[PDB]
Amino acid sequence: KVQLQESGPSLVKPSQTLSLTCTTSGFSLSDNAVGWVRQAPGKALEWLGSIDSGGSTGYNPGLKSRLSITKDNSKSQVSLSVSSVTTADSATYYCTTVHQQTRKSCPAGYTLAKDCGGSEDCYDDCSDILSSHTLSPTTTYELHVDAWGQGLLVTVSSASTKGPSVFPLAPSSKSTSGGTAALGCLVKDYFPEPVTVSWNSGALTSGVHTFPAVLQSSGLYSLSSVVTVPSSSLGTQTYICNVNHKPSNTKVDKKVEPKSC
């Protein structure tokens, strides 16, 4: 039941501050570390930073000057701010739970000073403490992401948001494959990404495929979603495509009705 929900703006102008929030459930926020990871389009995963159970934060060294991470245990929320954003900061941003642990081990004979009542150094003879052989402990760092959030796509652009226009792709005799028929919806001219599509409020999942968007020369995106249904059901069963465009807080339901031919 460990769930992580990123929230924040989908579009931000250059030089502005990107502020994201992560709402958590299924685990105690005050006893687990939460981290932010991002992935720019076509690039590799990039660590941003984390905050642990004690409230202490660690950041990516190359980006530390632009990053701020805070949390509120009583609200089950963790925040992330990125200052002076540019096009290079366009990415999917992930909230995560992270295992974090530093181990300091000493060889045989040498004892860690934190054990024997340079607290993080080894000592051969704790009785000497002054004439004792001392070394540096073998330090290993453990970090892995446990759970991943669904991610929030953030586009850095000076262009303006635009809600989508949804048009039916109605089946006909030129759209059937015998017992099955294809129908869909064309989601045209929206900005920015992403758009998700479901069918009959999610009650229809088999045969569904939502195609990746295409970038027109106008700067707007378009995509299509298709579903295969029995051809005999076109007269009776009604089919509705549910379009979700969070950047503009738009939801569109479009009934796809069959053509006469």
């Binding site: 934060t57 660690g58 970090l143 892995h144 792709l169 064309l186 295409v214 031919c261």
Partner: protein, 214 residues
């Protein structure tokens, strides 16, 4: 800062593939490497942590190992669903500082070939009443995922106004693609027919629509 992974690795169905992850003494060599699987259109999934420990729900055909500054993710009994991007990671000089690999795309060869099924939608009545016209050509259920799409007006090629998406995987491990032809409603009613022509593995499927036809 960025661990070194091969850009792409290939294997056949049922066979074995190893993905390498090379770093330095301050990350991979420090000895606690993790592995993550990214399927297109899905959140990342943790597969391996602590070099060899397997996360719950991960099949035992995923296995991790490490030798010095190089870690390896081995995938055996290779299945079509394994096609994804794979990233390694480890801490670097702090348990709150992570570095990731450059990523590896896994392709699973030896899957059943399939010719594409093409569906061409004419501009809808609603879009026409908005003084716009888009022809939508949907291509589905083909393998391998490499098609070429061409458009015709009556019988001459059409180059302008065409946008085509790169083929991506469906839920049944077959590939799908889409292509669009944007026209004015006048151009739509001008010619006698429009065609979407898809070439795939020495096969060509062409669908035609006509403004005079329903």
């Amino acid at each position: 800062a960025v661990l070194n992974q091969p850009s792409s690795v290939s294997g056949s169905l049922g066979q074995r593939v190893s993905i390498t992850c090379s770093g330095s003494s301050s990350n991979v060599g420090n000895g606690y490497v993790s592995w993550y699987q990214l399927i297109p259109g899905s959140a990342p999934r943790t597969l391996i942590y602590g070099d060899t420990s397997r996360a719950s729900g991960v099949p035992d055909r995923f296995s991790g190992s490490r030798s010095g500054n190089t870690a390896t993710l081995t995938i055996s009994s290779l299945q079509a669903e394994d096609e994804a991007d794979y990233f390694c990671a480890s801490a670097e000089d702090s348990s709150s500082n992570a570095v990731f690999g450059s990523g590896t795309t896994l392709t699973v060869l030896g899957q059943p070939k399939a010719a594409p099924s093409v569906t061409l939608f004419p501009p809808s009545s609603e879009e026409l009443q908005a003084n716009k016209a888009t022809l939508v050509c949907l291509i589905s259920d083909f393998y391998p995922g490499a098609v070429t799409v061409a458009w015709k007006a009556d019988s001459s090629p059409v180059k302008a106004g065409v946008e085509t998406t790169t083929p991506s995987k469906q839920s049944n491990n077959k590939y799908a693609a889409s292509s669009y032809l944007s026209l004015t409603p006048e151009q739509w009613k001008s010619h006698r027919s429009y065609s979407c022509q898809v070439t795939h593995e020495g096969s060509t499927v062409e669908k035609t629509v006509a403004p005079t036809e329903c």
